[PDB]
Amino acid sequence: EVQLVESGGGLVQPGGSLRLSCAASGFNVVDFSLHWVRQAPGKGLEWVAYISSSSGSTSYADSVKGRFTISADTSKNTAYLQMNSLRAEDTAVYYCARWGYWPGEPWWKAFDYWGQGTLVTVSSASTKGPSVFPLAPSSKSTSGGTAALGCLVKDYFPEPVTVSWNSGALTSGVHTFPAVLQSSGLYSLSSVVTVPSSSLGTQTYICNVNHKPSNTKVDKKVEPK
Amino acid sequence: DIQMTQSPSSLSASVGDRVTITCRASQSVSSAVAWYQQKPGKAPKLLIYSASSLYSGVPSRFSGSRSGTDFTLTISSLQPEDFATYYCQQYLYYSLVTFGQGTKVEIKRTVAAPSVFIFPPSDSQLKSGTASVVCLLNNFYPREAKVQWKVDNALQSGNSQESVTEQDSKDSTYSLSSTLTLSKADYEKHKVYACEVTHQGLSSPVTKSFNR
Amino acid sequence: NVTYITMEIFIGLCAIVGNVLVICVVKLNPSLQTTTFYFIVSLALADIAVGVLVMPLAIVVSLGITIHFYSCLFMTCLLLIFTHARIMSLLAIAVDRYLRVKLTVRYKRVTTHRRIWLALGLCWLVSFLVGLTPMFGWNMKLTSEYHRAVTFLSCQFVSVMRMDYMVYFSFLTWIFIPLVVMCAIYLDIFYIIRNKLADLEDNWETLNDNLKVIEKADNAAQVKDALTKMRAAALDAQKATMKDFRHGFDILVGQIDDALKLANEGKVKEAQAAAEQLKTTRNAYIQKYLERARSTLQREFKTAKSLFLVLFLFALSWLPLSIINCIIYFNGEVPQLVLYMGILLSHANSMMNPIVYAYKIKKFKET
Amino acid sequence: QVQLQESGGGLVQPGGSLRLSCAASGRTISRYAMSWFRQAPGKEREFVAVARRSGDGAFYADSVQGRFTVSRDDAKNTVYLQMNSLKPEDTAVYYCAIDSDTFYSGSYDYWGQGTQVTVS
Ligand SMILES: *S(=O)(=O)c1ccc(C(=O)NCCCn2c(=O)n(CCC)c(=O)c3c2nc2cc(OC)ccn23)cc1
């Protein structure tokens, strides 16, 4: 089966360096030109680089010109994207895609097979444990209808975090919001749940938040105020 | 250098609808225009190449057309698996690859007004040194809603971050969370904090507020 | 009375001799043996038939020789089957031409020789059914009470032919709608060809202008977009189709890609030197294939304009008579002299066909 | 400065079909969205339907979905509302509102005087 596998994408400092390895399996890199396309989180696709290992021809986008160097190994069947002087807007998911040579239908099928992508995170902040605060229901809120409550996970730098309510037993009405990147370089995540107001004072609500990079397990109980 | 201005950036449709996405090229790129489908969290998949030719394995409901510098992707009988983001790429040369801005295709349904909730900062956060007020917009459709943070009838803009969930599997609706982050010295200076929410399904804006 | 007789003897003789000459010219000349010229033979045969039966009918009606009602109906309906055969054959020519311009390769393989005989049989079948419809109980015996028992009367057009049929069924459904469709088809052909003559000129002009932009250039920024306009032009001009035509464009696009690689490296002089190798491919291939394609479309445009003059002279011949017949059904009066010219002009179309072939097609006057 | 011209209304039978139109004065609604609202007696103002700019889409409420149809001939600067399948609980005054921004956030500050639509 023809496939592309990316590797080498991880967490780097601004001004740092990174190397991504696009391992081709079902084809040969001298028969197909290999390209790098990145997708910023919340944004569209952007073409980055280009290697033609049959002819040695390289080209780069003007945002990555002079700072990104591309190469390919015919024996290892792998194309390398070496990153130098990374900055904040280079944080993206980098996809490796192949494209055939002129002439014929291999050229007209542009980026027919893509790699699964690898995530490059360029950010100056360091690994921080999450700070958890409860979003308390108001006592003078809507009575007789749905009452909303949540937990605000406010300051954590590595993005993957799992928030569960009552250890996964409560999953009706739970809205875990996407993490937004603050000006401090840390992520904030709100996780809310809407419950009936009659069950507000009879059922406890535990925000079980787990941050596996920092090995943090916080059991926050949310009370009415 | 070659711009691909994709005309629809938000497109709402249901199952069985006929949709049309228009991509305009800045100059002539001949037939070299491709169309891609990207589900969230996954790699893009080629659907149309050469602006008319269907890629192998793609269902026959996808189709392409070219009218000069205008390129059109059409789905005649839309399915639940067709709800993704759609990009147009011109591929006139290896180094001249530019993608479109992307057309999100979301599920159409009936307009629901948001259920606005406002959350005061807890005492556990207030001893930490910062105060963040969170407004929740629950179960609203469509996506376009505006949250204004009026603090003592003053529009506190430039310091509120909004996060919108993806469209829900059960009732096909959105949720929004607007967080107004302040220092404790700035938080104690004012008394009345309000969250004014305007939506297309609301006649008057809902102003959920609290006092210290 | 004798004016009409000798004018229709003239029309008849010219039409018969001319169209059998046209049949001979088509048969002898092996190059005029396509499907379009087969429908031209169909039109010629119908034209011969029109002449063969205008010759008796004119004097017979003029002398008022009493023939049977059904016999006069047979004569008039026969004249209508040949007339509508002419219209249907012209529609066949128009459809053939439209398919030829629209489908450059598909039309040829799809339309087999047996399929063209099937189409011709369907054509004359439709003509037979349409023209003989008055004989199938749509005559004067249908509704008119006085005209339902008449037998062995003087053969006149008012006495035997339902003018109601002529205005509504004959003209509107079968004369008017096919001429509207045919005129739309011909205008569509005149639009498609002039678009194909423009873009082939536009793809050639950008392949000539950007060759001269490169030869006066200083930096690779104004060279890189110059080949981008060529590469869009050479890809567009490749889709204008045996395999040698598209093989020369693969060299031309590949030589553009050989000089885009040099222009991306900042080499402004190696890209211009590699762009001078485009002119070797341009003179060896693009001179030969574009001028063959330009002359083929110009021959196709001139053939369509020649066939359009057949439609225009058909529309100049039977639309006047139709307007005269319109007044008749609407209970208006038509002068005798006005009417007589109308019938002559309707039969003048029989004589106009061969002469148009001689003046437009150059293979007819030589044979 | 903008007055919403209100047309249509009157008594209609159950199962009827009434056609409502709202015209703007002074400015053109081609680049905006037009929203329809109802006022039930004893209840608050309720969202009926919104017609987005060009062919973006027409969004309807839950109670009127599949029954109503909002459309706009923006050259004539008037939004139409094809009201079909009338129930006796739809005895409400119908208004119009101009969405004052491009991004469809729902800024309704140019309101209409209302058309009384009553059903037996
Ligand atoms: S005259 O008395 O010198 C005189 C009378 C009749 C004729 C003559 O040739 N009559 C035969 C019929 C001619 N005719 C047509 O051929 N067509 C075309 C049919 C496809 C018509 O449409 C005719 C027609 N005669 C008439 C008459 C009238 O109204 C009176 C309408 C249409 N129409 C020659 C000399």
Numbering used by the authors:
A (entry chain H): 4 to 228
B (entry chain L): 2 to 213
C (entry chain R): 12 to 252, 266 to 391
D (entry chain K): 1 to 120
Sentences from the paper on this structure:
Adenosine receptors (ARs: A1AR, A2AAR, A2BAR, and A3AR) are crucial therapeutic targets; however, developing selective, efficacious drugs for them remains a significant challenge. In this regard, the human A3AR is enigmatic because it plays dual roles under different pathophysiological conditions. Here, we present high-resolution cryo-electron microscopy (cryo-EM) structures of the human A3AR in three distinct functional states: bound to the endogenous agonist adenosine, the clinically relevant agonist Piclidenoson, and the covalent antagonist LUF7602. These structures, complemented by mutagenesis and pharmacological studies, reveal an A3AR activation mechanism that involves an extensive hydrogen bond network from the extracellular surface down to the orthosteric binding site.
The intracellular loop 3 (ICL3) was replaced with BRIL, and the S97R3.39 mutation was introduced to stabilise the inactive conformation. Purified A3AR-BRIL-S97R was incubated with an anti-BRIL Fab fragment (BAG2) and an anti-BAG2 nanobody (Nb) to facilitate structure determination, serving as fiducial markers and increasing the molecular weight of the complex. We determined the structure of the A3AR-LUF7602 complex at a global resolution of 2.7 Å. Focused refinement further improved the quality of the receptor density, yielding a map at 3.3 Å, enabling clear assignment of most receptor residues except for those near the covalent sulfonyl group attachment and Y2657.36. Clear EM density revealed LUF7602 deeply bound in the A3AR orthosteric site, interacting with TM helices 1–3, 5–7, and ECL2. The xanthine core of LUF7602 formed a π–π stacking interaction with F16845.52, a common adenosine receptor interaction. Nearby residue Y151.35 forms a hydrogen bond with the amine group that links the xanthine core of LUF7602 to the reactive benzene-sulfonate warhead. In the LUF7602-bound A3AR structure, N2506.55 forms a single hydrogen bond with the carbonyl oxygen from the C4-position of the xanthine core. A similar 3 Å TM2 shift was observed in the LUF7602-bound A3AR structure. Notably, this extensive hydrogen bond network is absent in the LUF7602-bound structure, partly due to LUF7602’s covalent interaction with Y2657.36 disrupting the conformation of nearby residues.
